[PDB]
Amino acid sequence: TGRPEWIWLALGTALMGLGTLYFLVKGMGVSDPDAKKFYAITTLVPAIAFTMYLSMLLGYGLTMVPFGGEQNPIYWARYADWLFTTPLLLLDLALLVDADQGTILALVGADGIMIGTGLVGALTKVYSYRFVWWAISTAAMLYILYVLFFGFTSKAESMRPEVASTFKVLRNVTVVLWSAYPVVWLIGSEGAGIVPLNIETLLFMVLDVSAKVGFGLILLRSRAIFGEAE
């Protein structure tokens, strides 16, 4: 507990753990193949986040990066988390709307670029170059958001109203929450260093729990995840 941000890492660990356990129990008994997919993806997201929050709490997921002539604490474990959880979250959305495979690959590929370039930016030793990587990552994010709003144009006249409804809600949650991440990065200690690491950790920890457990609660409560069955 020598790091001030430990409390947010602990709490994050606890909230992701407990969310995982709730989604394990809730999904118990589900036989519908379509619903099984959504429960698998959506359980599985906070399970990964739990391990990476734990890893940060215990100090494994932290490294020191020299830039600005200082040794800067960088939690690299975030990117290991997001590398897997953010395409899984996009897959939830894509499966909802029965997205084409081409569209799914575009989303997951862009996502991979977003997280990969975020990681390179996070570990870059030349200060000004960190923001070049930030810009590229943000461009990838904007591409993803574009596809979410303008890429499911063929899947509207055949979509079940509850699918459309739950998708629209989850898409809005996604755009609002995901758009905050580049802002937090930019102002936090990985970027401009105007907001201290402890507040920077609090902000991510609220975004993460909201984007994974919050998102999951909304999705797994909806009839949208079930095939139409009599």
Ligand X SMILES: CCCCCCCC/C=C\CCCCCCCC(=O)OC[C@H](O)CO
Ligand Y SMILES: CCCCCCCCCCCCCCCCCCCC
Ligand Z SMILES: CC(C)CCC[C@@H](C)CCC[C@@H](C)CCC[C@@H](C)CCOC[C@@H](CO)OCC[C@H](C)CCC[C@H](C)CCC[C@H](C)CCCC(C)C
Ligand U SMILES: CC(C)=CCC/C(C)=C/CC/C(C)=C\CC/C=C(\C)CC/C=C(\C)CCC=C(C)C
Q: Residue 203 binds which entry of ligand X, ligand Y, ligand U, none, with Cβ cut-offs from 5 to 8 Å by kind? A: ligand Y
Rounded-to-integer distance, Cα 26 and Cα 190, Å: 37
Kindly tell me which of 47 and 147 has the beta carbon lying closer to ligand U: 47
Q: Looking at this protein, which amino acid is placed at residue 20?
A: T
Among 80, 142, 159, 218, binds ligand Y (CB under 6 A): 142
Kindly tell me which of 19 and 191 has the beta carbon lying closer to ligand U: 19
Kindly tell me which of 110 and 119 has the beta carbon lying closer to ligand Z: 119
Site for ligand U in 148-207 (CB under 6 A): 206
Site for ligand Z in 4-43 (CB under 6 A): none
Contact positions toward ligand X, by CB under 6 A?
17, 20-21, 24, 27, 30, 36, 39-40, 43-44, 47, 50-51
Q: Which residues bind ligand Z (CB under 6 A)?
A: 48, 51, 63, 76, 79-80, 83-84, 119, 123
Residues that bind ligand U (CB under 6 A): 11, 15, 18-19, 22, 206, 209-210, 213-214, 217
